[PDB]
Amino acid sequence: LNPPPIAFPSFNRRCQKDWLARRAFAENEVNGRIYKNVYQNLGFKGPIPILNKVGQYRIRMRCISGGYSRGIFRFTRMARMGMLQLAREGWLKKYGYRPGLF
């Protein structure tokens, strides 16, 4: 019929939510170290509830040509189908991709 236009992903509420946490953590990244420094100097271990909603671990891998949050690698940043379509459309040849080898 007509394979998707891989440059512009469709709408996804969950996909957009993941990117929202990235901006919050970047601005609050400085405050994270201050909370650990004060406790270390005083010699007392305590929780940091404020880091729950702006923590680095809240963000996880997601598919750009997708919206699933599983089966995404750090090298390709795509799902099983995302890589297949990209490789079969003739776009990785310039980037040194020879499918002849197993």
């Binding site: 019929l1 007509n2 394979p3 998707p4 236009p5 891989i6 440059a7 750090r74 090298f75 390709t76 940043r77 379509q85 079969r88 459309e89 003739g90 776009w91 980037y95």
Partner: protein, 144 residues
């Protein structure tokens, strides 16, 4: 013992991504794949508008030159052609101004590049009967 046939085995299964000479490729493709669609949709459209009004096209350009520089440096008599308009498009890729004297874009002093009106070697060459995505404006139809 095959030495050349087994080259690169060490840096395939016993090496870290951050501790190897391999560079990422997704970063470059991010800004390259998007720009292809921009030139395709806006390519024919820009040329159609330029050719919409054949005559009287050079009058607007001549008057504009009298405001920027005042004196028309490229002035010519009525018996000589002024210029040929070439359909160009803006640059969207955020390239870095490198100090390479042999580069083709490092010495760019404008935000417009020429567009090829005809190409015989399509860059997005398919490996089979599959078509290019986003190249079917008209919706499909079924026999029903």
């Amino acid at each position: 013992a095959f030495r050349y046939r087994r080259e690169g085995q060490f840096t395939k299964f016993r090496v870290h991504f951050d501790r190897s000479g391999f560079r990422p490729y997704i970063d470059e493709l991010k800004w390259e794949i998007m720009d292809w669609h921009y030139k395709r949709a806006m390519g024919p459209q820009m040329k159609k508008t330029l050719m919409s009004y054949q005559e009287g096209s050079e009058k607007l350009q001549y008057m504009h030159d009298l405001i920027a520089l005042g004196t028309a440096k490229a002035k010519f008599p009525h018996a000589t052609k002024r210029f040929f308009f070439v359909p160009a498009l803006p640059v969207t890729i955020p390239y870095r101004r490198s100090s390479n004297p042999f580069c083709l874009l490092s010495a760019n002093k404008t935000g417009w590049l020429q567009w090829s009106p005809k190409q015989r070697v399509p860059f997005p060459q398919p490996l089979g009967k599959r078509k290019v995505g986003g190249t079917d404006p008209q919706p499909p139809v079924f026999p029903k």
